[PDB]
Write a protein that binds this ligand. Structure first.
Ligand code: HEM
Ligand code: HEM
Ligand SMILES: C[C@H](O)[C@H](O)[C@H]1CNc2nc(N)[nH]c(=O)c2N1
Ligand SMILES: C[C@H](O)[C@H](O)[C@H]1CNc2nc(N)[nH]c(=O)c2N1
Ligand SMILES: Cc1cc(N)nc(CCCN(C)C)c1
Ligand SMILES: Cc1cc(N)nc(CCCN(C)C)c1
Ligand SMILES: [Zn+2]
Lengths: 411, 414
């Protein structure tokens, strides 16, 4: 079959053939859609062959060598390893290709126009937390690049029995701590209070401040995780100020310039890389709307609207909306002023529509999660809002996994 | 057999069992989701094996709503509907069943953020209508009733059901009250670009265009598959709010105004296998409907540019968020205007809050509530409204409102 999707702002129509190559569940059934559910629901020898063959098949097809001598030998070599070792090892080329295509296949990611420019750091030779610490430090120094950020991933040893997992317990490489006070209130980032407790428990001496960079809590080979403090010179940070409101700096906000997911799982050929931190650069609304203005986060909306002499009696005065825009002007202006790479939601979506059209043209489609692609503010005035999108799961993929503190058995 | 949905702002989990009674497909599969497609999934004059089981379902459903979970009346009604399909080739709905069906189509409207009011719906049985003149009469009564001098009331008028496909009753307007869109000689568009085609059909039918920016379109009404007829709504029946801004005194000098009564008049109301092609239903606006979409959409009124000019915004680049900032002010102006004129309007904060309460209510008493997150989340400030963080299950329950073809694609002109 073919499938059509339509832009209702422009009437452009694209024809998705690539969905015929989708695999694991969307979660949706023939009669129920779950597109708004965030989390819907080790491989044995038999289970691993078809996966390995499919990915090797797709890699050799991507390099115009399908059915070739080097293709058929690779397959046989992988088949050998899974009999010998119940698993197999990716070549370097397959690891780079796998990582890039897992980003390419990230339905929820609006930045995928950059997918082919990923720096892949092979860390599969790593054995200890300290070594992970060295890889991530280098990852951050590279990615940050004095403000001119560069996409990168670092991939650590794949799963084995599941009893020897590598994990970055941090959900992002750079995050700020949260501290719950005895009086209910929260100092710092409420999102990270639980993780802040875990670190404190593991010996972290916290500065109990408002923007404390958290420590890396790194697990290697299934051992208890260990604490490392990122060197402060490596953590690029941007004080937030406003181009019109001089009082804005008096909020004393800042944010880190380098966004980096670390809690996720990278599947390639049926091999699971449970520690694969990846970084890019920020869309302004991630900080400006969600990090600062979510009620379960830094929640400076009332603060910012208070200083904007806004009527906060009636919601219909739209103070929340007014204050949300200004905060997002400031976020953008601040990164741009300090020449730290950032992208506004308009430019990012405009670029995602181009990328999506190009991906239908050369690839047969582009899986896309409209619920995640549409920015969290000003939705309808961005072009993705009027763009129909099909959601399927292509592999290689990034996958969610359980939090390590829910699984790990301490020793 | 039992699915849960979770709110991420408040950690509240609801357990959905109502989806087990979902009837037809959503367009999705285990393999590919279409939750962002607008339309996923005349001889359809059923046989008896095709129409009776649908009818039997709705009557079974109605009689179980009313505690007569099987009874004398329910059994007679089945046999009455049975013989009716045998002879009249279809069947007619009792007045109660019709009111139940209309209220429940709205209840099951997965895209409708306003459904907490679903049971306070005025139903106007117009199944005795035979002509477009009569349709015009019934609609003028709807508009006046529902407008209620600014204290808007929900209502639906239900014209006779489809029979053979070639005797359809249709309202050709998409909403009862829409502004005209005119194709300018150079290439621009005056008025509302969404309606350029409908405006030309009306002009091609002899409507004399005043050619302003907010000309109210005439009703194009179709009865019994016959050609459609133009009627001008009486202007004293079309309430309009001039748009001014509580702070920007230069705002009213934009020459902007909108209508007060939103009325969808192009959907199909399906009950027990019966299809009501003409069923205009009205409520009141969420401000974002007018001021985000009607006013700011690129292929609509596109006034962001002009508002931003007067606000003195850095329009050099997007990262200034000059669009966003003007978007806020406009919606402020729209709410401020409807409320200053005591015309019913609901902001997007209040509306989404209410629908969270509605959802909880439906999971209490019914075991679920089908919702379309893509449509429920307002088109501005989405994440700062409670629904953005509210997981939703979507499924199709009957009775329901369905889309249908624009009648001019499919109409044999007498
Ligand atoms: C290069 C610039 C990038 C931009 C502008 C960007 C933008 C975004 C945004 C705004 C989200 C939504 C996340 C949220 O709302 O919390 C997202 C999600 C995501 N992105 Fe990107 N991203 C970029 C790079 C990357 C890279 C380099 C990768 C992997 C190699 C990646 C993979 C993902 C994944 C897996 C998600 C899903 C997040 C989740 O489900 O938790 N992205 N991206
Ligand atoms: C009473 C106040 C109401 C409010 C505030 C409200 C709100 C909304 C909104 C914001 C939408 C999305 C519209 C858009 O952006 O295009 C919608 C859609 C819808 N509503 Fe409501 N609504 C109300 C009344 C009603 C009534 C009375 C009915 C039925 C009698 C109804 C049935 C529907 C349906 C079927 C849709 C889907 C429209 C479509 O699919 O194109 N609503 N509603
Ligand atoms: C492609 C996408 O489904 C389409 O633009 C939808 C998105 N969400 C919407 N939500 C509402 N309320 N109204 C709409 O018209 C739309 N359009
Ligand atoms: C319930 C809903 O799925 C949840 O709030 C989602 C919606 N869309 C999102 N979109 C983005 N970009 N980020 C998010 O966290 C979410 N959260
Ligand atoms: C690589 C990358 C870039 C970016 N801008 N954002 C992300 C996701 C941020 C974390 N959220 C899932 C909480 C990842
Ligand atoms: C009855 C009703 C009430 C309301 N508040 N909004 C609507 C939306 C109408 C336009 N869209 C479907 C194009 C309908
Ligand atoms: Zn779906």
């Amino acid at each position: 079959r073919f499938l059509k999707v339509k832009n209702w702002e422009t009437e452009v129509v694209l024809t998705d053939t690539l969905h015929l190559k989708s695999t694991l569940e969307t979660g949706c059934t023939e009669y129920i859609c779950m597109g708004s559910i965030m989390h819907p629901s080790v491989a044995t020898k038999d289970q691993l062959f078809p996966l390995a063959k499919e990915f090797i098949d797709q890699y050799y097809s991507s390099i115009k060598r399908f059915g070739s001598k080097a293709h058929m030998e690779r397959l046989e070599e992988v088949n050998k390893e899974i009999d010998t070792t119940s698993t197999y090892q990716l070549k370097d080329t397959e690891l780079i290709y796998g990582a890039k295509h897992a980003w390419r296949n990230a339905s929820r990611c609006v930045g995928r126009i950059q997918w082919s420019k990923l720096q892949v750091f092979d860390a599969r030779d790593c054995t200890t937390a300290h070594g992970m610490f060295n890889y991530i430090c280098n990852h951050v120094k590279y990615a940050t690049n004095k403000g001119n950020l560069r996409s990168a991933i670092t991939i650590f040893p794949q799963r084995t029995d599941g009893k020897h997992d590598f994990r970055v317990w941090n959900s992002q490489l750079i995050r700020y701590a949260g501290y719950k006070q005895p009086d209910g209130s929260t100092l710092g980032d409420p999102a990270n209070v639980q993780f802040t407790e875990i670190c404190i428990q593991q010996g972290w001496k916290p500065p109990r401040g408002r923007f404390d960079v958290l420590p890396l809590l790194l697990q290697a080979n299934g051992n208890d995780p260990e604490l490392f403090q990122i060197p402060p010179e490596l953590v690029l940070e941007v004080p937030i100020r406003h181009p019109k409101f001089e009082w804005f700096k008096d909020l004393g906000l800042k944010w880190y310039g380098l966004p980096a997911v670390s809690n996720m799982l990278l599947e390639i050929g049926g091999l699971e890389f449970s520690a694969c931190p990846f970084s890019g650069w920020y869309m302004g609304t991630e900080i400006g709307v969600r990090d600062y203005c979510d009620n379960s986060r830094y929640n400076i909306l009332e603060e910012v609207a208070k200083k904007m002499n806004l009527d906060m009696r009636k919601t219909s005065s739209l103070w929340k909306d007014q204050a949300l825009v200004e905060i997002n002007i400031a976020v953008l202006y601040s990164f741009q002023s300090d020449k730290v790479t950032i992208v506004d939601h308009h430019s990012a979506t405009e670029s995602f529509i181009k990328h999506m059209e190009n991906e239908y043209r050369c690839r047969g489609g582009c899986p896309a999660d409209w619920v995640w692609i549409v920015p969290p503010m000003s939705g309808s005035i961005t072009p993705v809002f009027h763009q129909e999108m099909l959601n399927y799961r292509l592999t290689p993929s990034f996958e969610y996994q359980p939090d390590p503190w829910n699984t790990h058995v301490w020793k």
